[PDB]
Amino acid sequence: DALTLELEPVVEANMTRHLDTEDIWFAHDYVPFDQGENFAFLGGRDWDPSQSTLPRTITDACEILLILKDNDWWGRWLGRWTAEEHLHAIALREYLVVTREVDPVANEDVRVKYTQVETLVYMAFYERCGAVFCRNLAAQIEEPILAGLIDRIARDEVRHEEFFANLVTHCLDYTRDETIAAIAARAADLDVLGADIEAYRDKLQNVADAGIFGKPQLRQLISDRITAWGLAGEPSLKQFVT
Ligand SMILES: [Mn+2]
């Protein structure tokens, strides 16, 4: 269709950029397997609170990320983007279970319509949320392995945002008032990361209190993203700009 055909040269240029500037990392390289130990089923010991040494703010933030991450040139991009997201989820899970920093039972227990433009706009904001969250988190982590891991993730999220946001720029050029309306509607309705997670109210409040991510960070990044599209004085969006 017509939008897909408009976007293909932009998808190509961005895929080309993303590949030529790639600096590939592996989840397994950020996991201190030497510290791992058998659980009680295999003759070791089960988890208990004494095994966790990281601040609860840091582990709450990581559990939120993990939950979110677990859930044609364009096809080439979606496949690449998907694999990067997946990579993040593996690294986080493996770090967490090897180090025993959280109760692994909790996170392993099986018992517990958008237009195309609307979708690209949503993803640009959502990746920017990811990038701010992981940047702020990495900056508060003193444990160097984990700090390294989260910093890798943050750098990928910057790249994700750049890619989606560039597609949105081409949408603003091809089909302006549609794109603006989509930005207005997302700006009004976006919530903090993990707002949809059942029973995470306490964890969200804790990561907000630490300044990693909350309503103030969300409000500012929304203003910055609108501004970065050159839309800061656009009449229907000035109410989301600080
Ligand atoms: Mn991402």
Check whether 86 is labelled as a binding-site residue.
no
Question: Exposed/middle/buried for 197, CB within 10 Å: 0-12, 13-18, 19+?
Answer: middle
Q: How much of the chain is in helix, strand and coil states, percent to nearest 5?
A: 70, 0, 30
Measure the CA–CA gap between 160 and 87, rounded to whole angstroms: 14
Measure the CA–CA gap between 228 and 230, rounded to whole angstroms: 5
What tokens appear for 219 in the block? 């409000």
Check whether 170 is labelled as a binding-site residue.
no
Measure the CA–CA gap between 221 and 66, rounded to whole angstroms: 22
- Distance from the alpha carbon of residue 158 to the mean position of ligand 1, in angstroms: 8
Residues around the ion ligand 1 (C-beta < 5 A): 127, 130, 157, 160
Q: Greatest CA separation found in the chain?
A: 65
Inter-helix orientation angle 116-140/215-228, to 10°: 130
- Distance from the alpha carbon of residue 79 to the mean position of ligand 1, in angstroms: 13
- Distance from the alpha carbon of residue 87 to the mean position of ligand 1, in angstroms: 10
The radius of gyration of the chain from alpha carbons, rounded to an integer in Å, stands at 20
* SS3 (DSSP) at 29: helix
Give all domains of the chain, ordered by start, each with its CATH number. 1-242 (1.10.620.20)
Question: Tell me, what DSSP letter sits at residue 114?
Answer: -
Specify whether the CB–CB gap between 98 and 31 falls below 8 A.
Answer: yes
Amino acid occupying residue 40: A
H or E segment to which residue 200 belongs? none
Tell me the resolution in Å: 2.0
Amino acid occupying residue 49: P
Measure the CA–CA gap between 231 and 237, rounded to whole angstroms: 7
Question: Exposed/middle/buried for 29, CB within 10 Å: 0-12, 13-18, 19+?
Answer: exposed
187: Cβ contacts below 8 Å, ≥ 6 apart: 125, 222, 226, 237, 240
- Distance from the alpha carbon of residue 67 to the mean position of ligand 1, in angstroms: 13
